[PDB]
Amino acid sequence: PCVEVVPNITYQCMELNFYKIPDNLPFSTKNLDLSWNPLRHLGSYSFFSFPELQVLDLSRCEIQTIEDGAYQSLSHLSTLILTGNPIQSLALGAFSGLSSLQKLVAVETNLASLENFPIGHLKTLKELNVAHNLIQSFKLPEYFSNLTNLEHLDLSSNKIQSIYCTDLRVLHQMPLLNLSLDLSLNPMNFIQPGAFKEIRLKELALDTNQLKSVPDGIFDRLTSLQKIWLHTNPWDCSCPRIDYLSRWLNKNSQKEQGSAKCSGSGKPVRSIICPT
């Protein structure tokens, strides 16, 4: 037994030195916290005895691998947290059976590429958090065209250096309703002209990166955009290089959260007026 938070519903099994999933818990359990347990590896049907699971926290469980069908029976699960696991191998069917998964948190799991991240069948997914990883390319794999319900994608604190036009290809031909994209805290110093064309976005975070400039009209092909973060970037406010951005930011002051500032002087980019 773990700490019973709610009878036959919620149990807290964090740090009890478990190496296997507990079998002495109600089959009606909805919430399970198994964080901080040397689980090391997950085999097929690891949670067969918990068909009612909706939220599963497995962060910091020293997990290295996950075999096909590890969560095969959990068809009611909507939140899976894998934060802090030194994952090194991820089978193709590792997330098989998660037909209701809405939130996947894979922060700090040594993720190096989205291509090999076997999540292309989680059509019900609404939130994907892969912040604090080793991803160095923002090129979205073709399977993203099946994630029609995605409204939040967090790629902050990774190794992304730039955003090419091709990177959002998949979203061009299979647009989402209200997508919020977080790309802050990346060593990003380049955005290719027309990389956000035909793209629909509700939020775009690009603060605390390495940007000095952006292509002209980069944000013209957008209207659903509501919030944007550009602060904490070494903006080059010489003219006419800063012309488009300074004007855009001034004609959209409500959208910008925080304040993009000019390197050196510290003057708001939206306050600069370039000569004609």
Ligand SMILES: *[C@@H]1O[C@H](CO)[C@@H](O[C@@H]2O[C@H](CO)[C@@H](O[C@@H]3O[C@H](CO)[C@@H](O)[C@H](O)[C@@H]3O)[C@H](O)[C@H]2NC(C)=O)[C@H](O)[C@H]1NC(C)=O
């Ligand atoms: C948490 O789950 C346990 C077990 O599932 C609940 O206790 C169990 O309650 C059932 C009644 O729904 C008991 O089963 C049988 O009930 C009939 C009533 O008609 C009675 O005639 C039988 O003799 C028998 O009791 C079962 O014995 C009982 N088991 C336990 C745990 O003692 C418990 O109520 C649940 N707690 C919550 C969240 O309310």
Ligand SMILES: *[C@@H]1O[C@H](CO)[C@@H](O)[C@H](O)[C@H]1NC(C)=O
């Ligand atoms: C998308 O999902 C369908 C249905 O399972 C599958 O056949 C297809 O290969 C997947 N990839 C594509 C085409 O985006």
